[PDB]
Amino acid sequence: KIKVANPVVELDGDEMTRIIWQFIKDKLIHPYLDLDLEYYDLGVENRDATDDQVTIDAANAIKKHGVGVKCATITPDEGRVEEFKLKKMWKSPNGTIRNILGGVIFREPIICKNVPRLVPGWTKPIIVGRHAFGDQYRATDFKFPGKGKLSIKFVGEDGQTIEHDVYDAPGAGVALAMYNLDESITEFARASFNYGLQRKVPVYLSTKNTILKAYDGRFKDIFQKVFDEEFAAQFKAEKLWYEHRLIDDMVASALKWSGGYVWACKNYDGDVQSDIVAQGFGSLGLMTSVLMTPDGKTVEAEAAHGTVTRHYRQHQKGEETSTNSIASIFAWTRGLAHRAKLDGNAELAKFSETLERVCVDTVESGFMTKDLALLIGPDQPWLSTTGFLDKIDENLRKAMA
């Protein structure tokens, strides 16, 4: 019944999350929304068959339509290569998508109060704003075979050159070059401070700028400049603040504080710290990850946990399973809230917010999948994969009426 005027780009995934994803469309999306989906299959078999062109097409379609929702995908190793007879070890589609879209990936716990915390002190959400571009994720790394000289060079388009000796190696080893871009750093600042202001919480940036004075100094300097120039008035008025901290200070502080801030993280730290944050609030499966592009026009919401292989086997052998589908639901729901914002579609916005509260309310009612049941204690019953979704469905009609 809810009419959606513009398309949403859908990136299909792998194994058990692919099955869950289809359950979600069949029960929670199509029966409630009149919705055009521009469909890309990022299953590993389609990526293989297309030599990974589908991933480029998908990223470009996201940039074109403004909204993408993405199902979890497996990242190949050697054994994945065997099992699927693949042409090679495909790199995660996520790296490619991030490289094209840029921006910031906002990660935050989906808090269900009956799920026990591993860090009891965390009583407010932590939001990690992971810089989505560069550093290790687009680096050039290689082995050097023995004694010799390593150097790095930049040549301007007008001939202007910088070149430095990096190491007089006394033996064989490994080297890497990585980079980032002032304009992407700038947009990382803007989105982090925009997200802070909007959530009404302070913003922290972690760096190692005492060691990487030029590289991490650039993040530190751009953040303070963007903050001073574009946000400090609004922050003062909302009684918020911005602070830069050394990464090793910030991570200890995060463990100890109660939460209630946006933590802007360089790509690598956002990758690693996001998982600690998620796990601390109680589960890798209870997190949103929403990439927001530099312009503010473009969003890609992802599930972002494993594709639950154990379960997929059981399901293939037509056995029963209970796979948590909450992170997948919230990929849809984060994508559709942005589709609503772009279209001015008040009924789609309310639909998103409502299905989000339903998920949290169902779990807090005592209706959840095995993985969550098991965290609560040995006695908590659980529903099956489709049993869980039917309950959400049932609650959602009730909520919507």
Next chain:
Amino acid sequence: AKIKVANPVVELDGDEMTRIIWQFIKDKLIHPYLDLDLEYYDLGVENRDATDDQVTIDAANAIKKHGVGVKCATITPDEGRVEEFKLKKMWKSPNGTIRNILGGVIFREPIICKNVPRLVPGWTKPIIVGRHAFGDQYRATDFKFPGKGKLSIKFVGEDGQTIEHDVYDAPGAGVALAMYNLDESITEFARASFNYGLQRKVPVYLSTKNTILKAYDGRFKDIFQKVFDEEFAAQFKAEKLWYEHRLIDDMVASALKWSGGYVWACKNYDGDVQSDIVAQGFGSLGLMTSVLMTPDGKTVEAEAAHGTVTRHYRQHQKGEETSTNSIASIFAWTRGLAHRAKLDGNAELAKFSETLERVCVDTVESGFMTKDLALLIGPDQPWLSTTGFLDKIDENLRKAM
């Protein structure tokens, strides 16, 4: 003096409140018990400034010569410090310089006091972090590049053979870094990790991002598995230990979920960051041991690895009362003295180190502790002052002998 110590210990003096503490430790806990020769290097910032930081290189070389260093926390200058002490320049991290000379692994482990609550109740057994001490971010070359152009990295063999890779066609201004590691440092990292795991009788884990940095991180992964297969698999299987590689993002969530009880070998940067998380999760950054062991296993640098407690230094400067935890500083001395005793076959010195460590722990567990720890127990548990606490440790040490 009374226990005779045959060979000298190299002493690295530090900054601010830690320098004050360090001196009370030498006067009250060391000189009265031990006939000890100290080979003294002042790495106070003003002395680094007078010697153009030569004193730091000299200290590190003297530790290599004599086998044992003990190191007070020091300032790493930022712009604030340059202006505050009117430094000639922003001298680099003295720990960076020391570690680059000595190589090896820095073993870090919480100092466990039963009456001090953890932030992570699931952590029932100690986590040991073995942080690779060489290379990567801590000996990198980084710089800004001012506009569009091409970035490349290059290796020229000593024999003249040349590897060269384009890294990025930049579209505008940015930052770049190169970093490296050495197969022989990686090999010795592995061997020191497995050896420590064997000695403490716990399993060993390595974390990398080898799926992203296939050559660089793949190299750590390959060497550890090879060293493990050839030199440790049998001994580990005999002791019911194991070795596993995990992706850093997997390891970090596992670590939070598990009980502890293992040696976690981290690359330089991840050991820097994760070992502060672990220290904080068990109680305090002041309840952490930090002992660098060189690749040949013959040399040790034990340090107080926390800041210099400027905030308390200020109070002490205007004769106000302070309560500064001196335990990590005591343990730098005791860990060094234990290695000195091992080199010298001095059983009386080894007993003395053991006894002082146990006195720190029994003292805190008695209910006698500084403000930082008292506050972990409850808003109203009482604390001793800086010297109140050191006088109590002293008394407990007299009795202990």
